[PDB]
């Protein structure tokens, strides 16, 4: 066996403890991945650190399922009901914001996103996140940094980021 196992890329050492990853099927030194032998006994399916990282980065790129869509509606609604969300519920009214459309070339708001969710416009989570981020970035670009509008965007985005944790 000439194969180099684990992240440390070394030959099999019969005297050392290894745990196998069910995702990539490689073998890892317990110590290299932070797994203790006594601990391994309590573990059923095991996923190594690298595979786990790839799966985490993967979440925003995989196809959205029907269950995912139920989550998107839930997230959207929690945002629409938030106290700092009032400035972003509907498209900006020109009469309320001088030259708004002359400053913001890609407007976005929660109502538009709700309609997009309804007609299954999003195919990957990254697209949903992009539209949401657009709302906050537009606000921060149009309004001054000491404006309560600017602060509403800061608060809602922080709220949104937490709400999305463990989504998929």
């Amino acid at each position: 066996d000439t194969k180099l196992y684990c992240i440390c890329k070394t030959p099999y050492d019969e005297s050392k403890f290894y745990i196998g990853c069910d995702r990539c099927q490689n073998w890892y030194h317990g110590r290299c991945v932070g797994i203790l032998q006594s601990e391994a006994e309590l573990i059923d399916e095991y996923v190594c650190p690298q595979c786990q990282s790839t799966e985490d980065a993967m979440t925003v790129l995989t196809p959205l399922t029907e269950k995912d869509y139920e989550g998107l509606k839930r997230v959207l609604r929690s945002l629409q009901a938030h106290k700092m969300a009032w400035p972003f519920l509907e498209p900006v009214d020109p009469n309320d914001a001088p030259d708004y459309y002359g400053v913001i070339k890609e407007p976005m708001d929660l109502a538009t996103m709700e309609e997009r969710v309804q007609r299954r416009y999003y195919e990957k989570l990254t697209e949903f996140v992009a539209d949401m981020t657009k709302i906050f970035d537009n606000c921060r670009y149009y309004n001054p940094s000491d404006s309560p509008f600017y602060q509403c965007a800061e608060v809602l985005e922080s709220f949104f980021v937490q709400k999305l944790k463990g989504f998929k």
Binding site: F17, G20, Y46
Partner: peptide
């Protein structure tokens, strides 16, 4: 979990 011992 699958493992290899000493």
């Amino acid at each position: 979990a699958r493992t290899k011992q000493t």
